[PDB]
Amino acid sequence: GAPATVTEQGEDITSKKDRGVLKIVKRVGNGEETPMIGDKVYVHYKGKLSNGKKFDSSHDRNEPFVFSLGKGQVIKAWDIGVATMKKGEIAHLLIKPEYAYGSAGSLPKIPSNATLFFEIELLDFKG
Numbered sequence: 001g002a003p004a005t006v007t008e009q010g011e012d013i014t015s016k017k018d019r020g021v022l023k024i025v026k027r028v029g030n031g032e033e034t035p036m037i038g039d040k041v042y043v044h045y046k047g048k049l050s051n052g053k054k055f056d057s058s059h060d061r062n063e064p065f066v067f068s069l070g071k072g073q074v075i076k077a078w079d080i081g082v083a084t085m086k087k088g089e090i091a092h093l094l095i096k097p098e099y100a101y102g103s104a105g106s107l108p109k110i111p112s113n114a115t116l117f118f119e120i121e122l123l124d125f126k127g
């Protein structure tokens with residue numbers, strides 16, 4: 001399925017080239033510009049654990065998730081990953097725990113040492 005495919009066929013977008021965050025672009029977005037540090041970014045997303053369970057979805061809330069890019073307001077992989085996206089892009093990310101919740105996990109949905117899958121759509125970004 002999609003998690004296996006990004007695991008096996010994704011591109012390493014980490015600066016360290018340690019394969020901690022792999023990406024596939026599923027829907028090409030608009031133009032060439034990606035957001036800049038500190039921008040307000042608006043995303044829709046859905047996340048799955050490695051046991052196949054959905055652990056979250058903004059779609060199901062009928063409102064986007066909004067954060068300021070590059071400020072550690074989200075897991076490291078999201079700051080790295082969303083920074084690579086164009087407006088209107090849909091991407092898959094496959095994230096090792098060192099770029100997510102590590103050994104601590106995040107109670108009560110995300111276990112210790114969890115590799116995560118996301119589908120993310122970058123709706124908009126604004127300074």
Ligand SMILES: C=C[C@H]1CN(Cc2ccccn2)C(=O)[C@@H]2CCC[C@H]1N2[S@@](=O)(=NC)c1cc(Cl)cc(Cl)c1
Nearest residue numbers: 045047055056065073074075078106107109110116
């Ligand atoms: C619930 C919305 C955020 C949560 N955060 C930031 C964050 C803020 C406070 C505590 C833990 N994590 C995040 O960094 C990431 C990435 C952005 C989308 C969501 N998460 S998340 O989907 N990451 C596995 C998530 C993270 C948790 Cl603890 C619960 C749920 Cl239901 C979903």
